[PDB]
Amino acid sequence: AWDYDNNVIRGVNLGGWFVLEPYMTPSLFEPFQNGNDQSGVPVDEYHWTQTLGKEAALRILQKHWSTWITEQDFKQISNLGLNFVRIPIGYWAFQLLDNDPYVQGQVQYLEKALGWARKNNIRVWIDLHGAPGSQNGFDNSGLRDSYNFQNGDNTQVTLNVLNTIFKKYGGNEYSDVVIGIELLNEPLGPVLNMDKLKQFFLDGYNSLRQTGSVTPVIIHDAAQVFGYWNNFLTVAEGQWNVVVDHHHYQVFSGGELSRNINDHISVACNWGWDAKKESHWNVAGSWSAALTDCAKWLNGVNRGARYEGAYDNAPYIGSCQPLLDISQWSDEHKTDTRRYIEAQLDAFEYTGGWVFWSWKTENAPEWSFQTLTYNGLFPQPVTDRQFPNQCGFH
Ligand SMILES: OC[C@H]1O[C@@H](O[C@@H]2[C@@H](O)[C@H](O[C@@H]3[C@@H](O)[C@H](O)O[C@H](CO)[C@H]3O)O[C@H](CO)[C@H]2O)[C@H](O)[C@@H](O)[C@@H]1O
């Protein structure tokens, strides 16, 4: 339903929908602030549903699920020249651990989205974004600061949830819409046992194919160096329709933020060169326009920004307040942003294409394809270049 050789993914994440991310929907978390004191604000969806209790969590999430993304979104996405969406969902949509605080109901909207994608000629990856015990300790796994996906029975539970996704979404009913099932969003390889992560990926690949599914398996790169996965899940071993998902940002350390704009573009170009050398099909499944980590709570609730020397002992570069609203941005920041977005587009189009993080946010413009487009900073059409050939690809 997709040509990974010939065609290029031009997509957005439907992030912040089935897995809450404080920086994406701060209004859902702000009511727990006591003036300027953020110490009472739930740091993730696990804590947010636990604090609210099941009734209120379901009331509030139903209102969110039903309005955050609708068919009109899919129409706009198509209108803008995009051909693809990546849809994060948490394991808890399918299975609760004993005593999980999460509420369910997301599958109804996932299924409405797959129909809206069909209606609008949009293809989809289903992405298991959060595993039990957390695979990365990010708030976007559902459970911040926990790293227990390989603890206890959590890997087996993650496999069982995958089997459910494989049966529901990897078969004939959606073979015109679903062009990938992603086994696990950003397992944080540096803190995990990679041998056990590889076995988990091989188990997921084998279970999906054993269902009769021909759907591509999307393996996230687990933060490994380019090429690390080249000899895993290979044609030589009869393991086929496998795509590696790489994520790329330059904002989550002091060193990467410190780069001048030319060096940020050189790094973006080099992602393209390096991805070209890889042996599997590969797509930049998450990236953004961000040159700063200024967005409120991007690093988590009750954490500041490295960009203004307020997190992680990073040195101060600049103040975040003027970068919060795209109408306060300097002409220099607007120009840096357009340059950066075009360079990443060119790099990611050099292999399988790209899936911007994310379609929309409440008020974080570096992370909103809609806001950036409406402000002329994301190319529209997406092939438009004000800064052509920054990378010199051949
Ligand atoms: O929280 C918002 C945003 O988080 C994104 O995930 C990032 C991780 O990708 C990131 O990984 C870092 C790298 O970007 C960088 O190059 O190297 C350092 C190591 O020195 C990495 O830590 O880690 C941060 C936490 O620091 C995560 O938030 C998601 O992809 C995005 O979808 C999410 O909305």
Ligand SMILES: OC[C@H]1O[C@@H](O[C@@H]2[C@@H](O)[C@H](O)O[C@H](CO)[C@H]2O)[C@H](O)[C@@H](O)[C@@H]1O
């Ligand atoms: O190039 C790596 C990808 O190769 C795929 O094998 C085949 C392609 O090389 C070929 O050109 O097209 C056929 C038809 O779809 C592919 O099977 C693997 O299947 C992929 O897993 C791999 O990433």
Ligand SMILES: [Ca+2]
């Ligand atoms: Ca910089």
